[PDB]
Design a protein around this ligand. Structure first.
Ligand SMILES: [Mg+2]
Ligand SMILES: [Mg+2]
Ligand SMILES: [Zn+2]
Ligand SMILES: [Zn+2]
Ligand SMILES: [Zn+2]
Ligand SMILES: [Zn+2]
Ligand SMILES: [Zn+2]
Ligand SMILES: [Zn+2]
Lengths: 104, 104
DNA sequence: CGACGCCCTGTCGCTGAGAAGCGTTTGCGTCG
DNA sequence: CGACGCCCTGTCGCTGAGAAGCGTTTGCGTCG
């Protein structure tokens, strides 16, 4: 099985530090293969704070989106998503427009 | 100080023997003050397998529910709860309907 | 943010805290 | 609902599964 565990983070567990770590420009990202996380949209594994899909039926990391990708491709802000207890990722909503999802 | 330590139990540590020891009928429970565990709902201390709340902010035994109580009062199966890495107890979800939690 | 002056002389953050289980305890309804 | 007889001898439900991220990767139009 190649699927990573999907751990839902409660909104109360979101801290002001990781809010400040939401990426505001894709060129400022820091890459780390060990401590980083992959945005589903741009497919870059970086250390900036990314979204957490809170649908229990979700799986893997398809719910992780960086700052620039979420706003530019879906008009949503990562800060709002992290504080929405009912937030679902675009793949869970069937609206993902990444190069793979819109191809199929 | 009067509160029993709450230890979050990883899903990978759940054994088939524990799943088999889930109570299917409250009349079949085995009481033991030393080796048993208390269900928050029915407040009986018995040896059957009970749920483990995985909310870090949880405490004590409020997250421990027996098989009959979880399905009859919440429509959930202890086996599913033990294998759910995001499972929170009804008191953590604020939906507990035991005689104490609905009293206030 | 923090000294500054004003009158009504003042207050929040963090940590770790926040029971458990024995006793009197088990659904519904007609009935003696 | 399930045997029962019929001819065309038969099929669905759950479970757990359903990637992730490095490499070749970043919008538009102009114009040399
Ligand atoms: Mg105490
Ligand atoms: Mg503690
Ligand atoms: Zn991205
Ligand atoms: Zn999702
Ligand atoms: Zn996609
Ligand atoms: Zn119980
Ligand atoms: Zn809990
Ligand atoms: Zn309760």
């Amino acid at each position: 099985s190649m699927t990573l565990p999907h751990i839902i983070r409660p909104v109360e567990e979101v801290t002001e530090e990781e809010i400040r770590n939401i990426c505001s420009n894709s060129r400022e990202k820091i890459y780390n293969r060990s401590l980083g996380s992959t945005c589903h949209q741009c497919r870059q594994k970086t250390t900036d704070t990314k979204t957490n899909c809170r649908n229990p039926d979700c799986w893997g990391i398809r719910g992780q989106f960086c700052g620039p990708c979420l706003r530019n491709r879906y008009g949503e802000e990562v800060k709002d998503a992290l504080l929405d207890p009912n937030w679902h990722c675009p793949p869970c909503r069937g609206i993902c427009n990444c190069s793979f999802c819109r191809q199929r």
